[PDB]
Design an enzyme around this catalytic site. Sequence first.
Site, PDB file in Angstrom:
ATOM      1  N   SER A 158       0.970  -1.155  -0.079  1.00  0.00           N
ATOM      2  CA  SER A 158      -0.124   0.138   0.087  1.00  0.00           C
ATOM      3  C   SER A 158       1.011   1.286  -0.080  1.00  0.00           C
ATOM      4  CB  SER A 158      -1.000   0.040   1.002  1.00  0.00           C
ATOM      5  OG  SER A 158      -2.412   0.777   0.877  1.00  0.00           O
ATOM      6  N   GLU A 170      -9.030  -5.840  -3.847  1.00  0.00           N
ATOM      7  CA  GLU A 170      -8.490  -4.621  -3.102  1.00  0.00           C
ATOM      8  C   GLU A 170      -9.469  -3.456  -2.531  1.00  0.00           C
ATOM      9  OE1 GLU A 170      -5.413  -3.911  -2.608  1.00  0.00           O
ATOM     10  OE2 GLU A 170      -4.174  -5.161  -4.057  1.00  0.00           O
ATOM     11  N   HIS A 212      -7.604  -6.369   0.438  1.00  0.00           N
ATOM     12  CA  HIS A 212      -6.283  -5.344   0.658  1.00  0.00           C
ATOM     13  C   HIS A 212      -5.578  -5.481   2.125  1.00  0.00           C
ATOM     14  CE1 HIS A 212      -4.029  -1.710   0.115  1.00  0.00           C
ATOM     15  NE2 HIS A 212      -4.201  -1.372   1.467  1.00  0.00           N
TER      16      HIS A 212
HETATM   17  P1  LIG Z   1      -2.633   2.099   1.999  1.00  0.00           P
HETATM   18  C1  LIG Z   1      -3.644   0.995   3.130  1.00  0.00           C
HETATM   19  O1  LIG Z   1      -1.571   2.617   2.815  1.00  0.00           O
HETATM   20  O2  LIG Z   1      -3.601   2.729   0.797  1.00  0.00           O
HETATM   21  C2  LIG Z   1      -3.682   4.256   1.168  1.00  0.00           C
HETATM   22  C3  LIG Z   1      -5.066   4.450   1.067  1.00  0.00           C
HETATM   23  C4  LIG Z   1      -4.929   6.032   1.315  1.00  0.00           C
HETATM   24  C5  LIG Z   1      -5.601   4.527  -0.454  1.00  0.00           C
HETATM   25 CA   LIG Z   2      -4.246  -2.044   5.756  1.00  0.00          CA
END
Ligand SMILES: *[P@@](C)(=O)OCC(C)C
Ligand SMILES: [Ca+2]
Lengths: 527, 527
Positions: free
Chosen positions: A196, A323, A436
């Site tokens: 992520s 996701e 996710h």
């Molecule tokens: P990842 C859980 O760090 O995703 C960022 C979110 C703000 C799209």
């Molecule tokens: Ca997470």
Amino acid sequence: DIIIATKNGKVRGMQLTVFGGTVTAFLGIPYAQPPLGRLRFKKPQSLTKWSDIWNATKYANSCCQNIDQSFPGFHGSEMWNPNTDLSEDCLYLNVWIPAPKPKNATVLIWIYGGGFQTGTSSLHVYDGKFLARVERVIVVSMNYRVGALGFLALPGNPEAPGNMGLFDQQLALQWVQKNIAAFGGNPKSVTLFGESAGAASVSLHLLSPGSHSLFTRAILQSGSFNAPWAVTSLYEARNRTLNLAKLTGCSRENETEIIKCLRNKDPQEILLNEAFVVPYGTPLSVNFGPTVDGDFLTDMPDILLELGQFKKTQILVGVNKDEGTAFLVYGAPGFSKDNNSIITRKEFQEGLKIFFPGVSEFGKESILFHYTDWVDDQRPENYREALGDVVGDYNFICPALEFTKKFSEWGNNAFFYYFEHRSSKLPWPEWMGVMHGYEIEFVFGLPLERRDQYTKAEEILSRSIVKRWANFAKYGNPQETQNQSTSWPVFKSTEQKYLTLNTESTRIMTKLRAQQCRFWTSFFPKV
Amino acid sequence: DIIIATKNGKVRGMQLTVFGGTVTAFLGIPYAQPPLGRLRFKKPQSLTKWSDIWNATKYANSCCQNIDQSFPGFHGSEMWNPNTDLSEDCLYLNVWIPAPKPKNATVLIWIYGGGFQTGTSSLHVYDGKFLARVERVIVVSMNYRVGALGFLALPGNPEAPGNMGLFDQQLALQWVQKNIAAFGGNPKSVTLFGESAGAASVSLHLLSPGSHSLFTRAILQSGSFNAPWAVTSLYEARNRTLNLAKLTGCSRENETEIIKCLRNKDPQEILLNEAFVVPYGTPLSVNFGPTVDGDFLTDMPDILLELGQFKKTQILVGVNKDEGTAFLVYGAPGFSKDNNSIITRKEFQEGLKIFFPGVSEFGKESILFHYTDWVDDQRPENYREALGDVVGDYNFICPALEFTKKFSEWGNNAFFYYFEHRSSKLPWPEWMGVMHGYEIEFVFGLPLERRDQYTKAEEILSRSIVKRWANFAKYGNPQETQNQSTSWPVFKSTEQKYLTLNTESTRIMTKLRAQQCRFWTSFFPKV
Ligand SMILES: *[P@@](C)(=O)OCC(C)C
Ligand SMILES: [Ca+2]
Ligand SMILES: *[C@@H]1O[C@H](CO[C@H]2O[C@@H](C)[C@@H](O)[C@@H](O)[C@@H]2O)[C@@H](O[C@@H]2O[C@H](CO)[C@@H](O)[C@H](O)[C@H]2NC(C)=O)[C@H](O)[C@H]1NC(C)=O
Ligand SMILES: *[C@@H]1O[C@H](CO[C@H]2O[C@@H](C)[C@@H](O)[C@@H](O)[C@@H]2O)[C@@H](O[C@@H]2O[C@H](CO)[C@@H](O)[C@H](O)[C@H]2NC(C)=O)[C@H](O)[C@H]1NC(C)=O
Ligand SMILES: *[C@H]1O[C@H](CO[C@H]2O[C@@H](C)[C@@H](O)[C@@H](O)[C@@H]2O)[C@@H](O[C@@H]2O[C@H](CO)[C@@H](O)[C@H](O)[C@H]2NC(C)=O)[C@H](O)[C@H]1NC(C)=O
Ligand SMILES: *[C@H]1O[C@H](CO[C@H]2O[C@@H](C)[C@@H](O)[C@@H](O)[C@@H]2O)[C@@H](O[C@@H]2O[C@H](CO)[C@@H](O)[C@H](O)[C@H]2NC(C)=O)[C@H](O)[C@H]1NC(C)=O
Ligand SMILES: *[C@@H]1O[C@H](CO)[C@@H](O)[C@H](O)[C@H]1NC(C)=O
Ligand SMILES: *[C@@H]1O[C@H](CO)[C@@H](O)[C@H](O)[C@H]1NC(C)=O
Ligand SMILES: *[C@@H]1O[C@H](CO)[C@@H](O)[C@H](O)[C@H]1NC(C)=O
Ligand SMILES: *[C@@H]1O[C@H](CO)[C@@H](O)[C@H](O)[C@H]1NC(C)=O
Ligand SMILES: *[C@@H]1O[C@H](CO)[C@@H](O)[C@H](O)[C@H]1NC(C)=O
Ligand SMILES: *[C@@H]1O[C@H](CO)[C@@H](O)[C@H](O)[C@H]1NC(C)=O
Ligand SMILES: *[C@@H]1O[C@H](CO)[C@@H](O)[C@H](O)[C@H]1NC(C)=O
Ligand SMILES: *[C@@H]1O[C@H](CO)[C@@H](O)[C@H](O)[C@H]1NC(C)=O
Ligand SMILES: *[P@@](C)(=O)OCC(C)C
Ligand SMILES: [Br-]
Ligand SMILES: [Br-]
Ligand SMILES: [Ca+2]
Ligand SMILES: [Ca+2]
Ligand SMILES: [Ca+2]
Ligand SMILES: [Ca+2]
Ligand SMILES: [Ca+2]
Ligand SMILES: [Cl-]
Ligand SMILES: [Cl-]
Ligand code: NA
Ligand code: NA
Ligand code: NA
């Protein structure tokens, strides 16, 4: 009693029993000056030196951050909340080494996600002891500043230049270059991995010239910097910094004075106002994130990617089958972790308004049109599933595939995976599918622990992923060569082969989400 | 009142309402002399001529055959039993034409399966009226002799030369060459299609020089002549013919006399003894099937295939995901349509002995070894699923893929499908999955009838398969060009792309059953 001499002084570790062997863990080694007082919002300053033995025997403070309180008592959300004290004094890192001490081990450096607003290296699902035991690699992870404390930007001004938390990550990479041979690591064989925002971070280190010599290769789990949440514009960063000032009573005319005022604020007041620096957020908001600062990032990163300005090396990139589902229960109407969330057309339409607040009516209709042509039975779950796919495709899957194509066009080997196994232990409901964040425990080898109630098929899937990741880090090729496994083909422009990761049978497939990603990648940016 | 003048005389058809339009059906047109008395066991003789109007308004007699009595009252088996009177007087064919009468329509000629022991063209699942309505093609199907009456062989002797039922099929192909323009068909655009033994038959017409000019292209559903049940050796044919004589009290010294005796037997006595001409059969036994007769088939067909001696044209070939399951409930121990058939290792071992009776102990162990390496949880269904895959891979899937490779190596376009949709109406239990024979109703467009209780997704899958089949017959390319469908790539040596047929999403995949078929194709034949 295991003591290692580093460039800054001695560190004592602790022994761990793992699978009938031992791992030595050094938890909480400092790698920078605590960024307090006059150092708040500035680049991490290098560590002074100590004399005495620094005891690295417990996880250190996590960085200040807001916490997820939407489902108190619920393991599905709470497993991601910080499990050590919050403090500005949080610039520490962990080292797990095989026992006996390896001679020249490959190094895996984990960068956690959390939207650049949250996260910590001490979560259970990031425990590197299983990888050190099983693959005889050294695993390193660092805490880096998040939220305004990590990414406030008044760009060009060194009191708050932006990207401080990416500089925290970089300074930890440097620590590993200078120190890891003392632990038995090879500074010449270092692979970054992250999920992520940790994956978007890894992708930005491929772009940053001050990171080029701090690592050898890269793994990106569900993230890359071309994702629409990953990089803040100069315009929106200034607006958000001055919005923060307004909210904290720190509006001044000299900008160096705004920052000085912001340095007198309790960290709680900064945290409490972060959510409001934007007129409307979404569950995917990254209010304080990477910016083009002219330092860590020299130009808009889309331009660097397109024009081939990045570290030439191998990459491993992937995404999970569902996701977008995790985000739907943080505000999309009709969704709930505690029922099946069968939503209507009207609810779907409302949900787009929740996820695409600045977007024109035509933009939102174009999304509805692309995603609601069924396919065909009606199918009460039609709209529920489409909304998860809208969010997952736009935010994670199409940017990852686009990153992988553009990167591979410049000559380097790229390997792409699609993770489609739902953990038998997942506390979230079934409709949310392969969420996710839920490959992470497979990557860190938690199902190798038979005491943990994962199934036998999961133990095998994890063992194989652990081996592919380790082979990628050591050899640049994520094969599992001994067990008649499916060969993982390089992802090329034109064919676009990827590997599916599942408990049943690994498949080679082509052109993941071809029709959907044409929409997001070539049409949506115009809207 | 619709009357067509043929080369042999007038035929009256009947009108049918289908989907708010009309189809004209001519059911039961004769295409040969009834093969009775002195004609029994001989090649079909050509039709004499009539004067008067032959009323083709009902299905004709099915050929004599034994019947499946294992599950009386059960639609799953009984749907395959003959639905018109059994008689030696059975050489008739059906023609379905669009209304109004087409001008130069492509012709689809269906050849049913039934192991070469059974089958009839009048089953509900073979009703060509939906294809004539929807695709405006003409559909033709013929009855052909089965069992000893169709395939008894004393080879070289014209009293019983072998392959008589393949000659019945050929003579029907000739009837279509001579007559179909009168019905509005194009004799220059004829595609044979068939399932199981009907598919093996279609593949043998690609090899037979007397069929080369009787058709343009070919579709093979779950069958090809290189399948281990499809062709009888000269050795086993003579043995079976003389075994038949022994059983009926017709052992003689002059072989022309054996046949003459066999011609005095009631057809029931021949049928009753067919099962016993072999010392041990299996549920897959083809006691009286195609032989190398020096006439229809000039050489061993494996040699013709390998050395490129066949009609150069396009082919469409496919198989169903669970080909082997249907056969397990006809004698494998521990199997039952009426429970989940969780079987043991011992039962699996017994089951191999049931399916591979002439095979050495080492041969059977090699099968057990290839199929029982799990993969890994135990998984009570492990042995049940493996036995279905053994039977399906050996008998259907690997020979089809091997046929498709060898055929395409000589330059012609080949398209391969893997059918993986289980009919919502299937009367067989779930564990049997996507059974052998259960694509047929999708191919003939039965789910297009909304009154029939198939789901909407099935109506769509059928419509699309109907269009691909019709495009294959008309244009040699089984695309569905109007609805943003997945493009069906040619199957080539090297890449081996195939298309999956399912209700959800069509996928292009590669190297179906690669590891399994290496076993059956390169190793098992040595055992
Ligand atoms: P990842 C859980 O760090 O995703 C960022 C979110 C703000 C799209
Ligand atoms: Ca997470
Ligand atoms: C699934 O639940 C949602 C979410 O909100 C609810 O959580 C439920 C499990 C239950 O405790 C309920 O009382 C709680 O409010 C339901 O949507 C909600 O329903 C009402 C009307 O009945 C709306 O006015 C609410 O605004 C709406 N909340 C949100 C956030 O949209 C939902 O209908 C339910 N779905 C089912 C049972 O299929
Ligand atoms: C599934 O059924 C089989 C098949 O035979 C049986 O059909 C059943 C539904 C039931 O009516 C039963 O009485 C009938 O015989 C079972 O295997 C059979 O079981 C017995 C011992 O209990 C053996 O000695 C038989 O020979 C055997 N028959 C065959 C053909 O193998 C089977 O055990 C059952 N499986 C289940 C319930 O999981
Ligand atoms: C950035 O600047 C302004 C600032 O407006 C904000 O004031 C902050 C301190 C904070 O509390 C925040 O919630 C508030 O929105 C943005 O102007 C907003 O836009 C609306 C209309 O969209 C106007 O009503 C106000 O000026 C203000 N909103 C509210 C609710 O009072 C501006 O949108 C933004 N620039 C961007 C996003 O590019
Ligand atoms: C073909 O020829 C013989 C014929 O044996 C058969 O006699 C038939 C009329 C019929 O009833 C059939 O069931 C019977 O098997 C085959 O010889 C058999 O082989 C066994 C040992 O395997 C001997 O006991 C007998 O000769 C005979 N069987 C029985 C049960 O009596 C022979 O196997 C076959 N040739 C092949 C298969 O290539
Ligand atoms: C480090 O740990 C050991 C405990 O075994 C101890 O002797 C030493 O004093 C410790 N240092 C501290 C608490 O600063
Ligand atoms: C570790 O391996 C590198 C090459 O990757 C080599 O240059 C280095 O000197 C090695 N160091 C050891 C074995 O201490
Ligand atoms: C603003 O104040 C700072 C710190 O007090 C000073 O160093 C700087 O030169 C000033 N600049 C402007 C433009 O007012
Ligand atoms: C390979 O197979 C063995 C034994 O069959 C198994 O225990 C091991 O987990 C496998 N290794 C990997 C890397 O998957
Ligand atoms: C054919 O059918 C029609 C019925 O409409 C009839 O006039 C004619 O006699 C029939 N021929 C027969 C029964 O042989
Ligand atoms: C039918 O089409 C063929 C070519 O496939 C042509 O040679 C023939 O004469 C046509 N006959 C018609 C329209 O009657
Ligand atoms: C056997 O008898 C047939 C028919 O009665 C006769 O035509 C044939 O020539 C005879 N052949 C032999 C070899 O006995
Ligand atoms: C194509 O789509 C239409 C309307 O969307 C549908 O009704 C028809 O069945 C489709 N045609 C084929 C050949 O699949
Ligand atoms: P198809 C049902 O005609 O299969 C032949 C069987 C004997 C293997
Ligand atoms: Br609407
Ligand atoms: Br054994
Ligand atoms: Ca999917
Ligand atoms: Ca595998
Ligand atoms: Ca399968
Ligand atoms: Ca059948
Ligand atoms: Ca499609
Ligand atoms: Cl492709
Ligand atoms: Cl491949
Ligand atoms: Na609708
Ligand atoms: Na076992
Ligand atoms: Na072998």
